[PDB]
Amino acid sequence: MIQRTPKIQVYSRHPAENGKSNFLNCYVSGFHPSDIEVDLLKNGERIEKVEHSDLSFSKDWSFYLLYYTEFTPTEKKEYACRVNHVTLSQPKIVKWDRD
């Protein structure tokens, strides 16, 4: 068995086709097992309709999830990614550092 804590990166990307589109991304990488809970948050609020949850694996025991959705960030909110994984005794919340 192997378990690997996800690396969690939260970042925004504008698809080059539409600069006004902005995706909040939670890239959860390298984890195993694949069981995982990933949410994008705005303040504590789960962003419900995350358009993309792209899971892949490299090696059988390394999973990668790009969990991203269009958003329109306000300065008035914090955006984060919350990951639960067995390796994470507490939900890991990684804030988007937009600047």
Author numbering: 0 to 98
Task: Give passages from the manuscript.
Comparison of the crystal structures of D76E-, D76A-, D76S-, D76G-, D76Q-, D76Y-, and D76K-β2m with those of WT- and D76N-β2m revealed no substantial differences that could explain their different stabilities and aggregation propensities (RMSD < 0.6 Å over all heavy atoms). For D76N-β2m, the network of hydrogen bonds involving the sidechains of N42, T73, and Y78 found in the CD and EF loops of WT-β2m is maintained in the variant. For other variants, the loop structure is maintained despite these hydrogen bonds either not forming (D76A-, D76G-, and D76Y-β2m), or being reduced in number (D76K-β2m hydrogen bonds to N42, and D76S-β2m hydrogen bonds to N42 and T73). Together, these observations indicate that the sidechain chemistry at residue 76 plays a role in protein stability and aggregation, but the behavior of the variants cannot be rationalized by their crystal structures alone.
Here, we report the use of the TPBLA to explore the role of the protein sequence in determining the aggregation of the naturally amyloidogenic protein, β2m. β2m is 99 residues in length (10.8 kDa) and has a seven-stranded β-sandwich immunoglobulin fold that is stabilized by a single disulphide bond linking Cys25 and Cys80 (31, 32). The protein forms the noncovalently bound light chain of the major histocompatibility complex class 1 (MHC 1) and is important for antigen presentation. More recently, two single-point variants of this protein, D76N and V27M, have been identified in amyloid deposits in the viscera or tongue, respectively, with the former occurring in the absence of kidney disease.
